[model samples]
Target chain A: KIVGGYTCQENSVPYQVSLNSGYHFCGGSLINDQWVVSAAHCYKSRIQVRLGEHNINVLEGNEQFVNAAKIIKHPNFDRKTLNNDIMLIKLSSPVKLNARVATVALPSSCAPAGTQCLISGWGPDLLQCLDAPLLPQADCEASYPGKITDNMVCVGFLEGGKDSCQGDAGGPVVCNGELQGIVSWGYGCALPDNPGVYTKVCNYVDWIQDTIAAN
Target chain B: RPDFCLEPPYTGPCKARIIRYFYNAKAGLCQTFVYGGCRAKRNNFKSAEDCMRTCG
Candidate 1:
């Protein structure tokens, strides 16, 4: 499983929704007023997408509620690396840009090896269990892909936690204020010796541009 | 650890038997036991008396 690169919110606010019992997992990025990006693997009942606030508890104001209209996972998203981990959603409406939240710019260049990546999501601050109060934290790339693959990036502590924990999946891996990777899978909720893996956005530039070309 | 567990839910005692024949050949846990993840389950228990009964 991949790990790292995303954050989690305190609760399922305007955008967060519980998938099923014992399966509180979903991935999304605020793109516009009504548009968000998340992984397709998160298709489930009561799926909620919250946009406009980092603090999940403030789910009511300046936020938008939308359901997934389409899941545009990378056609070649490796089931193993989950490379095409990128996806987009259509909101019922658009969101107005504000100071506290804004659409993260997609990564524009190839991520250099040894580059530190930042991950934020409503996931665990430690491993094993979910963090009670969702907050954002940053992690550096312990190791990242420089060859063989372009659509996948790697991060997190080889020793788990202090890395992405549960609830961080489907969140963005940002670098220098640009979205780079998608939190995929990891050995576990924080094995204390394993790093998280993520889907690199650099290689999928064409795919994303083409998909949003019409819109 | 390869940082991952072997994909298995292996359970049983004869598994203990086959394991004794290969790994832990000295532990002898397999002499009368079973474990999961094995290919041949009951095939090794016929007649209960013969070398062929070991695994075939």
Candidate 2:
């Protein structure tokens, strides 16, 4: 999710994890006590979660940096188009909330069409090119919502340019400020006509709950 | 799985861009074609085992 800007942005922060020595990527939303909803492919050898920090280094609040206990990717996820790209991460430890840090609500089993969702993340120019580290929010402009399929949903800038970019993968696509999808792969970061794509959360409602329950 | 032999068999998923080796019956070794993502289907295999070997 976008790290700065609106009041809600303060509630959500871009979770950056060090994949290697210098390389870092974005990740999940700390929803419940120990649950962090993220994208499956965000899994690398190692990573960290920075919360409530506007900048990457300024650790604020509980700012819990926990290792992934598990990564549950959707079974039928299509890697080509990157559909069903959702993944839930059970943190090694629970996050302690504060003024700037709080759990966002998860989407229900049924998200209605014209749900008017809000998305935020650090946009990318392309896969090879990740955008600046600043997180930004984009409003969804699609018609089909509540009836999302098992693996797909549409989230794009109605006006374009403002989209989820490369570094923004695994970010949150929220509706009414609630988590609806994970920022998956896309054609380009915030391309004008081709808005970014997202993993439909409605389809994975049971899987998420069941996995969390088991955890 | 079909029995296709490549000299000095590699390990794991047998991930090779060009797994060059021949079968006992076949004269020449086979080459593997590479593609990205999960759904890529390998060609030239006679059966699923052959395909899996090639894919690996």
Candidate 3:
């Protein structure tokens, strides 16, 4: 499903979700019974969030389909630059949580460079998982000179045999079940020295907590 | 007031905006869009208190 990644265990990531209009577009993570987190660029009209999906090719009967009631994109999101790429989707109704479908924890602090993380998504059909490490904000700026912002972090290898690709944005860069980053943008698929950029979730925890609580 | 509360909630032409409230007249009396707390097709009231102040 992704470059140099392998298919994940069925329903292994209870927090993984697929954002769909008719076909899958981006990956997402469930934050709670009614809230999902993804990248702002993948926002669309009348999008549906499908939970408990693994194969994504077959129904498997465990999927829960819910309409998006509210889509809260970060206010400073820019089209020219992928800054503040976070978005929150409040489901029209709360979903039932189980081993196959559940929520992930928000990060407590900003993960440092070299932090080991897992990136998961249904990039090409089936869900895939890749072992990635957080790149230093300074090192990331080298590849994307003047592009990477504090709101984003890079994750990948310099040689780049494995990485997230299209249909993978809005996915989770998870560390020990805590969501640390969101799959946002990439220069190319698994290109050398070009790590995948993601929205740093640690910077927005207060905003997310406040928004969810208010809504 | 400008008497704009009678029409419906209008968030203008943008797709993304803060979810503000509006009082759809529905025979007046400061009614919300849906379920007492839902974003409706028409919207603008900012708050129920404002919705009441305008429509009531």
- Say which candidate scores most in lDDT: 3
The ten-residue window of minimal lDDT in model 3 chain A covers: A119-128
lDDT per residue (tens digit) for residues A1-215 in model 1: 12333333332223322222222354466645545666544434345555544444444465544555555655765543344655666655565556544676766876675666556555422112121111112232333332224444556554555555445566666666666666665444455544555666676666676776655
Give per-residue CA lDDT, model 3, range A102-174, as digits (tens).
Answer: 9999997888888999999865367999998998888899988888888988899878899887678888989
Write candidate 2's Cα lDDT for B1-56 as tens digits: 24434332321110111222223323244443321112223234434456445544
Give TM per candidate: 0.58, 0.61, 0.78
DockQ for all models = 0.03, 0.05, 0.02
Q: Among these predicted structures, which one has the highest DockQ?
A: 2
Error of 3 at A120 (Å): 0.6
Sorted by TM-score, highest first, which candidate order results?
3, 2, 1
Better of 1 and 2 by TM-score: 2
Off by over 4 Å in 2: A1-23, A60-62, A123-150, B1-56
lDDT of 2 by residue, A166-194 (tens): 45566666666567777665444445544
Candidates sorted on lDDT, descending: 3, 2, 1
The i-RMS of candidate 2 is 10.6
Return the TM-score for candidate 1, rounded to 2 decimals.
0.58
